[PDB]
Amino acid sequence: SRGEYVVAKLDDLVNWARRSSLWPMTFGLACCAVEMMHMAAPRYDMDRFGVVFRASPRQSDVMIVAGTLTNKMAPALRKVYDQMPEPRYVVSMGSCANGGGYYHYSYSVVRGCDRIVPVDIYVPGCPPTAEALLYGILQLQRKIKREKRLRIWYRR
Amino acid sequence: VSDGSSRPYRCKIKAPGFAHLAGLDKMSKGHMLADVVAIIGTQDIVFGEVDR
Amino acid sequence: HHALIPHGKGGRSSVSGIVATVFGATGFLGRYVVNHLGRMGSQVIVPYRCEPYDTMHLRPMGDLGQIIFMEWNGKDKDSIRKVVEHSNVVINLVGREWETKNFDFEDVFVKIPHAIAQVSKEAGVEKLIHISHLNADIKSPSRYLRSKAVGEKEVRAAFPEATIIKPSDIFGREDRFLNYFASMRWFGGVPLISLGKETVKQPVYIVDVSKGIINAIKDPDAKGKTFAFVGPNRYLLFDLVQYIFAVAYRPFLPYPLPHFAYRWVGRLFEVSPFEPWTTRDKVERVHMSDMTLPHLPGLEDLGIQATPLELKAIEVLRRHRTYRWLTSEMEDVKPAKTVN
Amino acid sequence: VKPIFSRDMNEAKRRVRELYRAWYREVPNTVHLFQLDISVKQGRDKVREMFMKNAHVTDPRVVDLLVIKGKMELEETINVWKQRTHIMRFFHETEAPRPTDFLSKFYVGHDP
Amino acid sequence: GGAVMYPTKETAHWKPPPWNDVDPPKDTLVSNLTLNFGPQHPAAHGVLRLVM
Amino acid sequence: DTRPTIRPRNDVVHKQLSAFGQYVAEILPKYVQQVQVSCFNELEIFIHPDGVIPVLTFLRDHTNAQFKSLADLTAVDVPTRQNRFEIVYNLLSLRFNSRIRVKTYTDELTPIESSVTVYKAANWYEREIWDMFGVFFANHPDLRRILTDYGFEGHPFRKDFPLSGYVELRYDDEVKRVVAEPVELAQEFRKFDLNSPWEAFPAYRQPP
Amino acid sequence: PPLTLEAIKDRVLYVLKLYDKIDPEKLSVNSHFMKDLGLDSLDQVEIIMAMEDEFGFEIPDIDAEKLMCPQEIVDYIADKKDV
Amino acid sequence: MFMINILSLIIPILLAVAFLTLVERKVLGYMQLRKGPNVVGPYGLLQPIADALKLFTKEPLRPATSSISMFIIAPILALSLALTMWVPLPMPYPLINMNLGVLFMLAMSSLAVYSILWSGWASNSKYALIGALRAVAQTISYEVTLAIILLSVLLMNGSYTLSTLITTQEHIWMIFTSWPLAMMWFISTLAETNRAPFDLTEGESELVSGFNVEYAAGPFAMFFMAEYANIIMMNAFTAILFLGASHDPHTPELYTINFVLKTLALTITFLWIRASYPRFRYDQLMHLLWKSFLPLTLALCMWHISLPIMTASIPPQS
Numbered sequence A: 001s002r003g004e005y006v007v008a009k010l011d012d013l014v015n016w017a018r019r020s021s022l023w024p025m026t027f028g029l030a031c032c033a034v035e036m037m038h039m040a041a042p043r044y045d046m047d048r049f050g051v052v053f054r055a056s057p058r059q060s061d062v063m064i065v066a067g068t069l070t071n072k073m074a075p076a077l078r079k080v081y082d083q084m085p086e087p088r089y090v091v092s093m094g095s096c097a098n099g100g101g102y103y104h105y106s107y108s109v110v111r112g113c114d115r116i117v118p119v120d121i122y123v124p125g126c127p128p129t130a131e132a133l134l135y136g137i138l139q140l141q142r143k144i145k146r147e148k149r150l151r152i153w154y155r156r
Numbered sequence B: 001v002s003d004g005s006s007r008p009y010r011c012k013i014k015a016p017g018f019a020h021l022a023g024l025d026k027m028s029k030g031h032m033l034a035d036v037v038a039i040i041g042t043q044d045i046v047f048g049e050v051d052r
Numbered sequence C: 001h002h003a004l005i006p007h008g009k010g011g012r013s014s015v016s017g018i019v020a021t022v023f024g025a026t027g028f029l030g031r032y033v034v035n036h037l038g039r040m041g042s043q044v045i046v047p048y049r050c051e052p053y054d055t056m057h058l059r060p061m062g063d064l065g066q067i068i069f070m071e072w073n074g075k076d077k078d079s080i081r082k083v084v085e086h087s088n089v090v091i092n093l094v095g096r097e098w099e100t101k102n103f104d105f106e107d108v109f110v111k112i113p114h115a116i117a118q119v120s121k122e123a124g125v126e127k128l129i130h131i132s133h134l135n136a137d138i139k140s141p142s143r144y145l146r147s148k149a150v151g152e153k154e155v156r157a158a159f160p161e162a163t164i165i166k167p168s169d170i171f172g173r174e175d176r177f178l179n180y181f182a183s184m185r186w187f188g189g190v191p192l193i194s195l196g197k198e199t200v201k202q203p204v205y206i207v208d209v210s211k212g213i214i215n216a217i218k219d220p221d222a223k224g225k226t227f228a229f230v231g232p233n234r235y236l237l238f239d240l241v242q243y244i245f246a247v248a249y250r251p252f253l254p255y256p257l258p259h260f261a262y263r264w265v266g267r268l269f270e271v272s273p274f275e276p277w278t279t280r281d282k283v284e285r286v287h288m289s290d291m292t293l294p295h296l297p298g299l300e301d302l303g304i305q306a307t308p309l310e311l312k313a314i315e316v317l318r319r320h321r322t323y324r325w326l327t328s329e330m331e332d333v334k335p336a337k338t339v340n
Numbered sequence D: 001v002k003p004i005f006s007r008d009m010n011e012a013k014r015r016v017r018e019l020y021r022a023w024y025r026e027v028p029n030t031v032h033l034f035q036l037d038i039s040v041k042q043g044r045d046k047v048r049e050m051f052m053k054n055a056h057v058t059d060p061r062v063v064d065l066l067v068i069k070g071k072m073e074l075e076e077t078i079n080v081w082k083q084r085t086h087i088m089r090f091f092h093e094t095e096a097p098r099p100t101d102f103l104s105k106f107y108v109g110h111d112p
Numbered sequence E: 001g002g003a004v005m006y007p008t009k010e011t012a013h014w015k016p017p018p019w020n021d022v023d024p025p026k027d028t029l030v031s032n033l034t035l036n037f038g039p040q041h042p043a044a045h046g047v048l049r050l051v052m
Numbered sequence F: 001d002t003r004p005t006i007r008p009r010n011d012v013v014h015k016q017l018s019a020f021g022q023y024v025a026e027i028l029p030k031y032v033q034q035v036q037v038s039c040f041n042e043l044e045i046f047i048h049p050d051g052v053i054p055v056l057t058f059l060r061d062h063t064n065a066q067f068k069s070l071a072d073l074t075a076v077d078v079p080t081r082q083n084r085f086e087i088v089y090n091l092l093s094l095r096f097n098s099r100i101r102v103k104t105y106t107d108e109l110t111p112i113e114s115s116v117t118v119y120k121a122a123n124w125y126e127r128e129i130w131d132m133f134g135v136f137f138a139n140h141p142d143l144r145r146i147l148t149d150y151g152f153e154g155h156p157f158r159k160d161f162p163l164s165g166y167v168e169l170r171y172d173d174e175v176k177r178v179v180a181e182p183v184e185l186a187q188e189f190r191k192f193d194l195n196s197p198w199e200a201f202p203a204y205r206q207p208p
Numbered sequence G: 001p002p003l004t005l006e007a008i009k010d011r012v013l014y015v016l017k018l019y020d021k022i023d024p025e026k027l028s029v030n031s032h033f034m035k036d037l038g039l040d041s042l043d044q045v046e047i048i049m050a051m052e053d054e055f056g057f058e059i060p061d062i063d064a065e066k067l068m069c070p071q072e073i074v075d076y077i078a079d080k081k082d083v
Numbered sequence H: 001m002f003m004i005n006i007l008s009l010i011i012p013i014l015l016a017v018a019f020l021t022l023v024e025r026k027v028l029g030y031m032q033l034r035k036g037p038n039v040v041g042p043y044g045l046l047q048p049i050a051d052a053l054k055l056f057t058k059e060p061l062r063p064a065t066s067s068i069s070m071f072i073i074a075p076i077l078a079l080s081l082a083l084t085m086w087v088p089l090p091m092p093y094p095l096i097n098m099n100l101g102v103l104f105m106l107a108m109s110s111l112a113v114y115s116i117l118w119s120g121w122a123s124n125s126k127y128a129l130i131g132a133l134r135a136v137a138q139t140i141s142y143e144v145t146l147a148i149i150l151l152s153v154l155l156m157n158g159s160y161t162l163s164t165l166i167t168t169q170e171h172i173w174m175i176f177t178s179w180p181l182a183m184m185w186f187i188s189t190l191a192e193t194n195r196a197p198f199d200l201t202e203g204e205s206e207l208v209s210g211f212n213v214e215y216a217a218g219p220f221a222m223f224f225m226a227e228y229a230n231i232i233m234m235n236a237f238t239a240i241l242f243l244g245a246s247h248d249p250h251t252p253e254l255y256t257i258n259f260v261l262k263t264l265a266l267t268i269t270f271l272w273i274r275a276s277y278p279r280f281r282y283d284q285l286m287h288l289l290w291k292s293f294l295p296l297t298l299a300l301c302m303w304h305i306s307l308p309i310m311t312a313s314i315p316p317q318s
């Protein structure tokens, strides 16, 4: 039908804009934040893909949890995530943020940021290489490309 | 600290930035907010070693 | 056949043997039902027809592998089969307060319930928890409550040993009842039929309803029983809305609107292709007084004591206050008059 | 043994009362500042409950240490170093009630 | 002596001015701003809560 | 012995450290209980817990001991002693290019005089010792939690404190906040028994 | 308006009535808190704090330990107010 | 036809702002051994469109502590004034020809400040309040010097009419006559637009996001557009004032092109300065503008008052 075609084309336009102008917040916790800086380094240049590191959570689209998420830090991470205006995405970088990593059996480490915020992409490594994080972000762009938000609305 | 076994009994780590950050208030006396940003950077602090 | 021995301490990493398929878990009640199931260590299967993004908030509710997401179609029994095939409990929460283009109250409160109940028997599911509405009448003024009664009979026909729950007006953080009245401030006054003096409502907290569903599954005697989940206090519509505008610190301007005019206003808001702000059935349901059914067990029989609205109303309506009245406590506002 | 702050239990009890007054007069501010969804009575009862947990203590050194930790907890609350999550951790809500009856324990699991 | 020659009940509570007209300074001390230079801040290295 | 595998031993520094240990013991016999020099040229002075301030102030101000830098301040938990907590002071002397160690002991209740007046670095070190072990330092300008969570209960670096702790955090959708719950592990920490049943070093054999 | 002993007694008894744990049957100017009303040390501390709020002065714990009866509270308030 | 002219002065300016975002990103990248947006569209030409669509499809949040009325009015004032300050610009013919267009520009800039003030105040956040106070301090420091330098350089123009600037510079750029005033005016324009070494109102590395920290989606896009439109407009003002261009009355395109190129060069220098220097401390900004510029601006004002009289070169009134 003509209705589905317009909605599908509109959905592609909306998805293309969101996935090609991802704005991660400047949020780094540990060793993995250093490799995150190397993704913004000239060699890999995350800004080349439109991925620009905004500072305030209210002006961001992705939260890249890069580092160990301690118990003392967990409430701060959740509130900063909640203050992100939707649509917002979470990318877990490093084994520390995935399932606790080296400090899984620690009295003051949350066993993965998944227990605090919903995660869209898990980037494995300790630390994941700057390409591995870039691969995860480019994988997130593909995941957003497969978002039929308006197309489902037309069929609700 | 070694007890004779193959696992260390106690391993205290002395972070150089642990003492430097303790004196942040001492150094940032009479300085503005923008100067504290400078003072934090000049101490070369990585919180992995500070928070062992 | 799928019988599991509970293990652990009932925590996040425990095993409870409560493998469940919560239909319509992407909704106000669904979130709490899944969260209660997830925290006990239950294999929760969440069917969804929306975008996986909308299901993201359900992900942290369970341990690794304890929350499985798989798509389903309400008009495809095959999709229902693959989502209830390995479940020993099935909970039906699918329900929309407004008729859509492709789904009407009959399709959501009669056809789907019947399909879920029918397929569950085929797969051998042990326990089914159906959620109707306290005021479900075969001759009710509202089509929403009309279909809610027809589907109730069909579920018992398809699934004879199925627990049926009839919540009154669930209220909570993401509710469309307390937020509904508090959002009427944008339209100036508060239109109420007969100034809300001829309607009695007995709202129920969202947590109590969710815990009642979980306790119903745990209870071995809930099979075949029909429960009615109601709050501990009955309020007049005018008194309840005034209390809603009281803890919200909003100027309460109630003006009586005739029934035909209010129905006309409801029709205007149905034009919106998105979620309507109000509906003609929404108007009739709000004006309809809550039924009293002392012949049915409630939350008390399941061990959960209903929480009074006064204790849990500050949570819902705090976001509706201005900066002036954000830090005000929950004790300054006096409880409204209850018709008990 | 060398004392910490008090040489007698009466002296130690004095500091406990001083801490309780500070805690009792802080609860209205804690509910207001943290925007808690509880009543002032609930917080003040909770303060009483936590004090009553350490009621069997008889060693004055332990009493002083408990008050020292009590003041530290109060300072975090006054300075809003704690958050709403930290304050509401005393009111265990997500934790399911664990019955203390033998037959109830027997039904649930192998817990001794 | 006193504030006025013919004092009344209301005026009797009011005391005479200081001898050097220097009113005792008030103790309404100005409170500072407890800004939270918290973890999210870009200059805080992500895991530093600076309560200034 | 000799040859590349072994580590060379310097006797000159050993003699100097032994002489300085005798010097310190002579000057401060009221608090010094024992003096040792390890084979790798590290000097340790053992001090009665009341001698923290006097001995440290001597080692900081004395013309023949200018240990003006507090290298480290830690505690060692040995739960087999009456005074399980062993407080260790690491000092550095830039004037004589040497280091010294001061070791005291304390119980779970007996406080220790705070060396903030001696070294201003001891502030956060004593805060960390209190947070991790529970040792209380009297006359401390600001003693509170430095490394653990704000509502944390217990001192983790104690030998009897479990590795995984007692509580864990997660986000609950009902209460809209991070909540603490008793720790439950998907996989238990597999404890390994690694010690060999055969004596490795005959030089450290304890009497039967 | 000058302060009177009867006014102090009435205000003290009103504050005691406001306290929930105090049963009005045993409540009298002479009735001991712990011995008769059935109160704890912490309950007495809460009562002292309520009296401080009512009368707007600070009672050190040294005096609060002495205060055990409503008449004793009235006497302390009168002495502090010179009434 | 006048409405068509209004649209042909507003929509192209918004497109220029949108693509100036991309130009800035790519210039910073290539000055940082990087590559600017290069994936979205050919050479990144589709990046601004993606950014705009994302921002306007992003959920805007209304802070609970914020005063809604001011919080919404501030962005509107910022953009409306940013689009209005282009009305009197002579390129070569001004849309609205005012005898005192220069004072109109000054007044419009002075009003635009309240956008940052109210956005900061109404945001009801500590960082936003700090950003608003920093904006206040910034406008305290540059306004006097800005006005004095502008007056001194217009003393050789004969009037505050902007169009006359083209005639005055018919044989020679006015920068050859007031290059110290040109330098000070350039720095004052940098400080005014909350730009390079003077990005104190926003303070990304010190105030997270400054006054606009609580702004998201559409309103944030409006503030960004207003900021960059003010950048381009101020660079255009610098071009017409000092870097005069030839105007053949029968071929206005010649001026338009020369003007555009000069404005583009000045904007590129703005980005160049942004990626070359550290940020000032606003105490140091105020001290500089009050103790190194202001005395010199007063001295040069005296000089440029006395010079036409002492050289019998007073410009015509009409």
Ligand SMILES: NC(=O)C1=CN([C@@H]2O[C@H](COP(=O)(O)OP(=O)(O)OC[C@H]3O[C@@H](n4cnc5c(N)ncnc54)[C@H](OP(=O)(O)O)[C@@H]3O)[C@@H](O)[C@H]2O)C=CC1
Pocket (backbone or CB within 6 Å): C023, C024, C025, C026, C027, C028, C029, C030, C048, C049, C050, C074, C092, C093, C094, C095, C096, C097, C103, C108, C131, C132, C133, C134, C166, C167, C168, C169, C170, C171, C177
């Ligand atoms: N106060 C109340 O809300 C009361 C409600 N009830 C009934 O109990 C249940 C409680 O659910 P509630 O929290 O209100 O849910 P919501 O209205 O918040 O959300 C409806 C849920 O049902 C799903 N759903 C609705 N229609 C369809 C459809 N045609 N096909 C597939 N899925 C569908 C939705 O999935 P999706 O989001 O993807 O569309 C969503 O998960 C409902 O059946 C409700 O009518 C009874 C008494 C009181």
Ligand code: SF4
Pocket (backbone or CB within 6 Å): A030, A031, A032, A033, A066, A067, A068, A093, A094, A095, A096, A097, A101, A102, A125, A126, A127, A128
């Ligand atoms: S995953 Fe490895 S590198 Fe990354 S933060 Fe954890 S420990 Fe550091």
